[PDB]
Amino acid sequence: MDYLRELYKLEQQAMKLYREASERVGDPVLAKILEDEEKHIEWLETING
Amino acid sequence: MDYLRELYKLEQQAMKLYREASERVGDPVLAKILEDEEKHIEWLETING
Numbered sequence: 001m002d003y004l005r006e007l008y009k010l011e012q013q014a015m016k017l018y019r020e021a022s023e024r025v026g027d028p029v030l031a032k033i034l035e036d037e038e039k040h041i042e043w044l045e046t047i048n049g
Numbered sequence: 050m051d052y053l054r055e056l057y058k059l060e061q062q063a064m065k066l067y068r069e070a071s072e073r074v075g076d077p078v079l080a081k082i083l084e085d086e087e088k089h090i091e092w093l094e095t096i097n098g
């Protein structure tokens with residue numbers, strides 16, 4: 001059992017960087033991407049079914 | 050700026066797997082996820098210059 005753990009350990013890893021870089025990249029679509037990736041963690045734990 | 054390449058190499062690394070696992074897991078939201086991550090490579094290229 002490792003599928004969703006590899007997804008979590010890439011999607012949260014990307015999310016950390018998307019949230020970090022925002023104040024230094026200074027573009028609005030970075031903030032929009034956080035809202036997209038939030039569904040991709042909620043659906044992630046749903047994929048345990 | 051050497052910033053977005055570290056995000057690219059996580060978003061495209063996740064993409065590689067999201068298209069592979071889909072037929073095995075059999076969930077329609079899994080196929081929706083790889084569709085949403087395409088914008089996250091288009092915008093991630095454009096914002097890199």
Ligand SMILES: [Zn+2]
Pocket residue numbers: 011036037040086
């Ligand atoms: Zn995602």
Ligand SMILES: [Zn+2]
Pocket residue numbers: 014037060086089
């Ligand atoms: Zn993404």
